[PDB]
């Protein structure tokens, strides 16, 4: 792929299901000026991914206080994403979302980020931290069965922002 | 770039390491088949953020041993540089005695194989890799230089891969 630490994160333009439940075409570059956590999950209607997606959505306000946009993505269609959102939470659905979910049906976004599992056409569990100038700061890739931690992601986002700011702090 | 791919054999290496007993030894990743491995890079010796990470992994090595997991650190510095840093007491800014081996990658080929060499600076990013007991790469972590890693998160990951190893085995 083309995701390199210290280089601009690969842009994308893709259809996402938005928190209001409608579809919108969004780009990574829409979020310049804010940190971005961009994470891939393999497929909709699976059993590890919902724990992660719901945790990032549930805790979205902790990312907003860090001026950080969270974006999820999978190769499944945006229609499939919405179907999972609309499945009742008590029956296994995602329920209402506080984060957008991108659809990568051509697999080009997962390829650009180096996380496509080529022999199956789905993404590994890749997570990327992109700073407010668009520069990639952190790469995380898990094999399919093992989920990610919102606590760890918050730790990293905050730590990068602190080290970003150290040199402009008042010298008193 | 690099040859580290999830679900494929982790790139092998053979390199001089400073072992916990203070001796040099040429070791290979394949020496540790039968154990999980946490293999982590740091940019260079005698720095500020890196010793806190290295000491944290060394101090907590028993928690990895209980998971049948070997921890190995690495940088492009010479094996003499590693040994001098170990022989510098922690209270004077050194590493002090270590419970983990520290690999020397002076030709930068290990960092290149793992995709973590920072071009034109000749140092590695803060890369960390989790390799299972069959030598297969399960997890990739790469931090830009300013931000360190968490032993807690690394243990959570090792535990989680070992958990999922307990179902779905075909052979
Ligand atoms: C941080 C602060 C400063 C004052 C201050 O009241 C304050 O609240 C904060 C947080 C000082 C000490 C004030 C003076 C400057 C800003 C100077 C002066 C300079 C001409 C300016 O006014 O912008 C240029 C910047 C410079 C040299 C650095 C910061 C600070 C020393 C300063 C930072
Ligand atoms: C599991 C598998 C094996 C191959 C394989 O392609 C595969 O998909 C799975 C799930 C191997 C590596 C194949 C060879 C055997 C089956 C051997 C050979 C043996 C003669 C047989 O054919 O059954 C006897 C069993 C033996 C020695 C152990 C398993 C495996 C090494 C194997 C398991």
Author numbering:
A (entry chain B): 4 to 175
B (entry chain A): 3 to 173
Please share excerpts from the published article on this structure.
Peroxiredoxins scavenge ROS via their peroxidase activity, reducing hydrogen peroxide and a wide range of organic hydroperoxides. PRDX1 is a crucial antioxidant protein to regulate oxidative stress. Then peroxiredoxin 1 (PRDX1) was identified as the ROS-manipulating target protein of Celastrol in colorectal cancer. To obtain homogeneous oligomeric and less flexible proteins for crystallization, the Cys-52 and Cys-83 residues were mutated to serine, and the C-tail of PRDX1 (176-199 aa) was truncated.
To reveal the stereospecific conjugation and binding mode of Celastrol, the crystal structure of PRDX1 in complex with Celastrol was solved to the resolution of 1.76 Å. Then it was found that two PRDX1C52SC83S,1-175aa monomers formed a head-to-tail homodimer, and two Celastrol molecules were covalently linked to the Cys-173 residues of the homodimer. Moreover, the 2Fo-Fc electron density map contoured to 1.0σ for Celastrol linked to the Cys-173 residues confirms that Celastrol is a covalent inhibitor of PRDX1. For each PRDX1C52SC83S,1-175aa homodimer, the covalently linked two Celastrol molecules stretched into and formed non-covalent interactions with adjacent homodimers. Interestingly, the binding modes of two Celastrol molecules with adjacent PRDX1 homodimers are different. For one Celastrol molecule, direct and water-bridged hydrogen bonds were observed with the Trp-87, Asn-89, Gln-94 residues of adjacent PRDX1 homodimer. While for another Celastrol molecule, direct and water-bridged hydrogen bonds were observed with the Arg-140, Thr-166, His-169 residues of another adjacent PRDX1 homodimer. For one Celastrol molecule, hydrophobic contacts were formed with the Phe-48 and Val-172 residues, while for another Celastrol molecule, less hydrophobic contacts were observed. The covalent binding residue (Cys-173) and non-covalent binding residues are from different PRDX1 homodimers. It is known that PRDX1 homodimers form into decamers in its catalytic cycle, then this unique binding mode of Celastrol with PRDX1 homodimers is likely to disrupt the decamer formation of PRDX1 homodimers.
